[PDB]
Design an enzyme around this catalytic site. Structure first.
Site, PDB file in Angstrom:
ATOM      1  N   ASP A 186      -0.612  -7.635   1.385  1.00 17.44           N
ATOM      2  CA  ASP A 186      -0.008  -6.307   1.478  1.00 17.44           C
ATOM      3  C   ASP A 186       1.502  -6.480   1.664  1.00 17.44           C
ATOM      4  O   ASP A 186       2.052  -6.385   2.764  1.00 17.44           O
ATOM      5  CB  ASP A 186      -0.656  -5.529   2.614  1.00 17.44           C
ATOM      6  CG  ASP A 186      -0.273  -4.053   2.612  1.00 17.44           C
ATOM      7  OD1 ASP A 186       0.330  -3.591   1.620  1.00 17.44           O
ATOM      8  OD2 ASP A 186      -0.574  -3.378   3.616  1.00 17.44           O
ATOM      9  N   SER A 237       3.815   2.106   8.683  1.00 15.87           N
ATOM     10  CA  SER A 237       3.490   1.001   7.797  1.00 15.87           C
ATOM     11  C   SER A 237       4.655   0.683   6.866  1.00 15.87           C
ATOM     12  O   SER A 237       5.506   1.528   6.576  1.00 15.87           O
ATOM     13  CB  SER A 237       2.234   1.313   6.990  1.00 15.87           C
ATOM     14  OG  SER A 237       2.445   2.338   6.027  1.00 15.87           O
ATOM     15  N   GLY A 238       4.697  -0.569   6.436  1.00 11.66           N
ATOM     16  CA  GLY A 238       5.816  -1.112   5.697  1.00 11.66           C
ATOM     17  C   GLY A 238       6.995  -1.555   6.529  1.00 11.66           C
ATOM     18  O   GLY A 238       7.773  -2.402   6.072  1.00 11.66           O
ATOM     19  N   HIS A 242       0.814  -1.213   0.000  1.00  9.66           N
ATOM     20  CA  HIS A 242       0.000   0.000   0.000  1.00  9.66           C
ATOM     21  C   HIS A 242       0.848   1.264   0.000  1.00  9.66           C
ATOM     22  O   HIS A 242       0.319   2.350  -0.293  1.00  9.66           O
ATOM     23  CB  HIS A 242      -0.962   0.019   1.188  1.00  9.66           C
ATOM     24  CG  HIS A 242      -0.298   0.261   2.506  1.00  9.66           C
ATOM     25  ND1 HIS A 242      -0.179  -0.718   3.471  1.00  9.66           N
ATOM     26  CD2 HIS A 242       0.274   1.375   3.027  1.00  9.66           C
ATOM     27  CE1 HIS A 242       0.438  -0.219   4.526  1.00  9.66           C
ATOM     28  NE2 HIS A 242       0.732   1.048   4.280  1.00  9.66           N
ATOM     29  N   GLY A 261       2.582   6.327   9.438  1.00 12.94           N
ATOM     30  CA  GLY A 261       3.992   6.454   9.121  1.00 12.94           C
ATOM     31  C   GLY A 261       4.832   5.257   9.505  1.00 12.94           C
ATOM     32  O   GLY A 261       5.998   5.173   9.089  1.00 12.94           O
TER      33      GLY A 261
HETATM   34  C1  LIG Z   1       3.665   8.566   5.598  1.00 15.61           C
HETATM   35  N1  LIG Z   1       2.865   9.501   6.357  1.00 15.61           N
HETATM   36  N2  LIG Z   1       3.330  10.725   6.666  1.00 15.61           N
HETATM   37  N3  LIG Z   1       2.376  11.323   7.373  1.00 15.61           N
HETATM   38  C2  LIG Z   1       1.320  10.459   7.492  1.00 15.61           C
HETATM   39  C3  LIG Z   1       1.618   9.282   6.847  1.00 15.61           C
HETATM   40  C4  LIG Z   1       0.788   8.087   6.725  1.00 15.61           C
HETATM   41  C5  LIG Z   1      -0.616   7.993   6.811  1.00 15.61           C
HETATM   42  N4  LIG Z   1      -1.059   6.739   6.674  1.00 15.61           N
HETATM   43  N5  LIG Z   1       0.079   6.046   6.499  1.00 15.61           N
HETATM   44  C6  LIG Z   1      -0.004   4.620   6.287  1.00 15.61           C
HETATM   45  C7  LIG Z   1      -0.773   4.350   5.014  1.00 15.61           C
HETATM   46  C8  LIG Z   1      -0.162   5.120   3.860  1.00 15.61           C
HETATM   47  O1  LIG Z   1       1.207   4.759   3.809  1.00 15.61           O
HETATM   48  C9  LIG Z   1       1.951   5.517   2.867  1.00 15.61           C
HETATM   49  F1  LIG Z   1       1.477   5.240   1.620  1.00 15.61           F
HETATM   50  F2  LIG Z   1       1.677   6.813   3.127  1.00 15.61           F
HETATM   51  C10 LIG Z   1      -0.520   3.822   7.452  1.00 15.61           C
HETATM   52  C11 LIG Z   1      -1.790   3.260   7.512  1.00 15.61           C
HETATM   53  C12 LIG Z   1      -2.162   2.514   8.633  1.00 15.61           C
HETATM   54  C13 LIG Z   1      -1.263   2.323   9.681  1.00 15.61           C
HETATM   55  C14 LIG Z   1      -1.598   1.507  10.855  1.00 15.61           C
HETATM   56  C15 LIG Z   1      -2.516   1.885  11.833  1.00 15.61           C
HETATM   57  N6  LIG Z   1      -3.194   3.088  11.742  1.00 15.61           N
HETATM   58  C16 LIG Z   1      -4.538   3.287  11.816  1.00 15.61           C
HETATM   59  C17 LIG Z   1      -4.657   4.653  11.767  1.00 15.61           C
HETATM   60 CL1  LIG Z   1      -6.085   5.581  11.818  1.00 15.61          CL
HETATM   61  N7  LIG Z   1      -3.420   5.220  11.664  1.00 15.61           N
HETATM   62  N8  LIG Z   1      -2.518   4.245  11.647  1.00 15.61           N
HETATM   63  C18 LIG Z   1      -2.791   1.055  12.923  1.00 15.61           C
HETATM   64  C19 LIG Z   1      -2.152  -0.175  13.064  1.00 15.61           C
HETATM   65  C20 LIG Z   1      -1.236  -0.560  12.087  1.00 15.61           C
HETATM   66 CL2  LIG Z   1      -0.432  -2.078  12.223  1.00 15.61          CL
HETATM   67  C21 LIG Z   1      -0.966   0.272  11.000  1.00 15.61           C
HETATM   68  F3  LIG Z   1      -0.085  -0.126  10.072  1.00 15.61           F
HETATM   69  C22 LIG Z   1      -0.009   2.914   9.555  1.00 15.61           C
HETATM   70  N9  LIG Z   1       0.337   3.635   8.469  1.00 15.61           N
HETATM   71  O2  LIG Z   1       1.495   4.137   8.398  1.00 15.61           O
HETATM   72  C23 LIG Z   1       1.224   6.796   6.515  1.00 15.61           C
END
Ligand SMILES: Cn1nncc1-c1cnn([C@H](CCOC(F)F)c2ccc(-c3c(-n4cc(Cl)nn4)ccc(Cl)c3F)c[n+]2[O-])c1
Length: 236
Positions: free
Chosen positions: A93, A188-189, A44, A186
């Protein structure tokens, strides 16, 4: 990472920060070194990434503020996304990044092992999530890499918490019943790293969740052991 603490230099040497450079340079996702030319991350991350041309992989980084116009990075030769990936919440994913050249491993840039052949029935009790993500739902990308120890939960329990999603054997969940520690925006990955027999294994890839560290809402991770055949096929 919510509920976590700052890491020190060299503590998570397989952790990378993947930056995009369009329209401006910024942290996009975490990822994990698994070979001299290979990073494992979440599919993603590449929503709206026009091509590998705009990606930069930084290894050896503790503080995002270390990254300057002369900081060395790896170019990305190819983004390999699992064929069945549609969106994070529905599974598959996982993505490989093939770098343009080989990482020479050093104290601050090291690979993490995949879950081993014959360890599918191991119960991991020492698991950690790491990243530069938010410390709360309304936060900012962090300068210093954070870490948090989080317990794995059973797939049965995880499905009970997410009755609107398909929690399959290809996912693994992690979180406290009472909340307080989790990945957030932030992270994720990046890796869910578990230590077994004093060796670190890449058990999960941080994928998605309902909010951050909420009660009875564990984070959901790509279950890396179920993708080992896919990884080996792509890295050879
Ligand atoms: C990079 N960035 N800079 N400022 C903002 C960002 C940003 C914004 N969303 N994300 C990603 C998706 C897009 O990723 C990339 F494409 F941007 C993302 C999506 C989901 C999760 C996540 C969550 N959860 C739910 C909620 Cl609500 N929040 N988190 C909870 C548990 C687990 Cl286990 C998770 F993984 C983490 N992340 O990181 C990066």
């Amino acid at each position: 990472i919510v509920g976590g603490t700052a890491s020190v230099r060299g503590e998570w040497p397989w952790q990378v920060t993947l930056h995009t450079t369009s329209p401006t340079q910024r942290h996009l996702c975490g990822g994990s070194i698994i070979g001299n030319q290979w990073i494992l991350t979440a599919a993603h991350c590449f929503y709206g990434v026009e091509s590998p041309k705009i990606l930069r992989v930084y290894s050896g980084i503790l503080n995002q503020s270390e990254i300057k116009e002369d900081t060395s990075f790896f170019g990305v030769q190819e983004i390999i996304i699992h064929d069945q990936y549609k969106m994070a919440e529905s599974g598959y994913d996982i993505a490989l990044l093939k770098l343009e050249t080989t990482v020479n491993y050093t104290d601050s840039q090291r690979p993490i092992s995949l879950p081993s052949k014959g360890d599918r029935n191991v119960i991991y009790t020492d698991c950690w999530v790491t990243g530069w993500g938010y410390r709360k739902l309304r936060d900012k990308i962090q300068n210093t890499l954070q870490k948090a120890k989080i317990p794995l939960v059973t797939n049965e329990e995880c499905q009970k918490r997410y009755r609107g999603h398909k929690i399959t054997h290809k996912m693994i969940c992690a979180g406290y019943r009472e909340g307080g520690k989790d990945a957030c925006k932030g992270d994720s990955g990046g890796p869910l790293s578990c230590k077994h027999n004093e060796v670190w294994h890449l058990v999960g890839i941080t994928s998605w969740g309902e909010g951050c560290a909420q009660r009875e809402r564990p984070g959901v991770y790509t279950n890396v052991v179920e993708y080992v055949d896919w990884i080996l096929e792509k890295t050879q």
